[PDB]
Enzyme design. Structure first.
Site, PDB file in Angstrom:
ATOM      1  N   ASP A  22      42.309  23.220 -25.799  1.00 27.30           N
ATOM      2  CA  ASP A  22      41.128  22.677 -26.478  1.00 27.30           C
ATOM      3  C   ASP A  22      39.908  22.776 -25.548  1.00 27.30           C
ATOM      4  O   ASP A  22      39.337  21.784 -25.090  1.00 27.30           O
ATOM      5  CB  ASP A  22      41.413  21.236 -26.907  1.00 27.30           C
ATOM      6  CG  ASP A  22      40.397  20.686 -27.917  1.00 27.30           C
ATOM      7  OD1 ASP A  22      39.375  21.362 -28.213  1.00 27.30           O
ATOM      8  OD2 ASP A  22      40.609  19.549 -28.405  1.00 27.30           O
ATOM      9  N   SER A  48      35.425  13.182 -25.440  1.00 25.45           N
ATOM     10  CA  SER A  48      35.864  14.566 -25.641  1.00 25.45           C
ATOM     11  C   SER A  48      34.973  15.559 -24.900  1.00 25.45           C
ATOM     12  O   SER A  48      33.756  15.592 -25.112  1.00 25.45           O
ATOM     13  CB  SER A  48      35.874  14.906 -27.131  1.00 25.45           C
ATOM     14  OG  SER A  48      36.893  14.199 -27.812  1.00 25.45           O
ATOM     15  N   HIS A 100      37.215  21.278 -30.299  1.00 24.96           N
ATOM     16  CA  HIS A 100      37.029  20.383 -31.444  1.00 24.96           C
ATOM     17  C   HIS A 100      35.678  19.684 -31.403  1.00 24.96           C
ATOM     18  O   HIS A 100      35.232  19.170 -32.437  1.00 24.96           O
ATOM     19  CB  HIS A 100      38.189  19.360 -31.563  1.00 24.96           C
ATOM     20  CG  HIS A 100      38.091  18.182 -30.630  1.00 24.96           C
ATOM     21  ND1 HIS A 100      38.822  18.091 -29.465  1.00 24.96           N
ATOM     22  CD2 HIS A 100      37.367  17.037 -30.704  1.00 24.96           C
ATOM     23  CE1 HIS A 100      38.549  16.949 -28.856  1.00 24.96           C
ATOM     24  NE2 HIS A 100      37.667  16.290 -29.586  1.00 24.96           N
TER      25      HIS A 100
END
EC number: 3.4.21.19
Lengths: 221, 221
Positions: free
Chosen positions: A98, A174, A56
């Site tokens: 992810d 992230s 992402h």
């Protein structure tokens, strides 16, 4: 707007100033211009021309890796001790985690990212267990832009491709490497469930094959 | 900023105006005030007091379900035919998928969300296969706020708790129901890999148990 990860009761974080020392130099700041503004994230150098981060995160480039800037060892907005490296090829993990490899071009001096910093060591994850003391180190977005922060805590869950911990992270983290006490990468932070835990992609045997199949000089200890 | 999902070559989307007709009424718009602004997402009514959506969507409430507004059958910013229902309890999926149940309170008239619309039918997913024609229907953020859009495409991948498709979605679609041709929910959209595919949580046997263990009146066909 988004809130990918959570401030938890354990909010034990401090800024890294000597970002090129030791295992810190492979921790990387990611900057992506999008919709007139920018997205930022984190990653970790694991090979001569490669970092790991989230699916992402690289998505912010809208399919074009050249929209991504990677600054390994970023110290602040006006202090990139290793400059930047430009995204070249996005290699998503074929599984359901992810996780993505981002290959980067050499810089304007023909230096490769894995020459200016030491690529991180990937743990075999054969000793990794619940209640182990770990750190997650990257670029939380509630701090000044491109400042590196280490967050301290414990593993609370390991299963499949998921490892969870009780430590605090913030949008911007992230893709941050998860380090054990030997400073080896056991996971890649991607998110959490507020306010219960934060979550990473656990580098299990199947993830390791993906790393091996794509990064010839990967260092798995 | 974020870019959770991708415009793909297949960008076949149209607006739903009769949002309370048929299987559309359970499609739900989610609004969360955060940091002076707002986050929005999507979900689907599956029980008397319950919707499904993403873990990363409910996270916007920072642990407090009462920050979440759910508008089933939202038509536009000034047209909520069923009003709103306020988040009451967040029940994350214990597995590794980006899936959460959000239980909601009854509205100011003591109506329950599963009384004003028909709860969606969950597919058993025993016939669901690659190349099947599907739709993903929710609230993409590149359209006017709280307008419902259906996106048409095909399943390209099914494995574990992941189902991928070739159809386009946009930030805001997070949590959108994935419908098969019989208008049953086979998955919950959560993201994608740009610009290769978009991704949903596949409602496999283990996800179904989670639904059964928490939603007594769940309708699995």
């Amino acid at each position: 707007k988004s809130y990918p990860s959570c401030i938890l009761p354990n909010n034990n974080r401090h800024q890294i100033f000597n970002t090129t020392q030791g295992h810190y130099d492979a921790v990387s700041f990611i900057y992506i211009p999008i919709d007139g503004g920018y997205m930022s994230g984190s990653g970790v150098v694991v090979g001569e021309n490669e970092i790991l981060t989230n699916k992402h995160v690289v998505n912010g480039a809208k399919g074009n890796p050249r929209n991504i800037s990677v600054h390994p060892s970023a110290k602040n907005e006006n202090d990139y001790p290793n400059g930047k490296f430009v995204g070249q090829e996005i290699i998503p993990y074929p599984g359901n985690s992810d996780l993505a490899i981002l290959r980067v071009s050499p810089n304007e001096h023909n230096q490769h990212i894995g020459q200016v910093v030491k690529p991180a060591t990937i743990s075999s994850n054969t000793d990794t267990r619940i209640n182990e003391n770990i750190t997650v180190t990257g670029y939380p977005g509630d701090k000044p832009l491109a400042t590196m922060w280490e967050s301290v805590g414990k593993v609370v869950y390991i299963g499949g491709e998921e490892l969870r911990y009780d430590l605090s992270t913030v949008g911007g983290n992230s893709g941050s490497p998860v380090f054990n006490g030997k400073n080896q990468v056991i996971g890649i932070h991607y998110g959490g469930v507020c306010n219960k835990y934060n979550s990473s992609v656990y580098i299990n045997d199947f993830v390791q094959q993906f790393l091996r199949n794509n990064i010839p000089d990967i260092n798995i200890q």
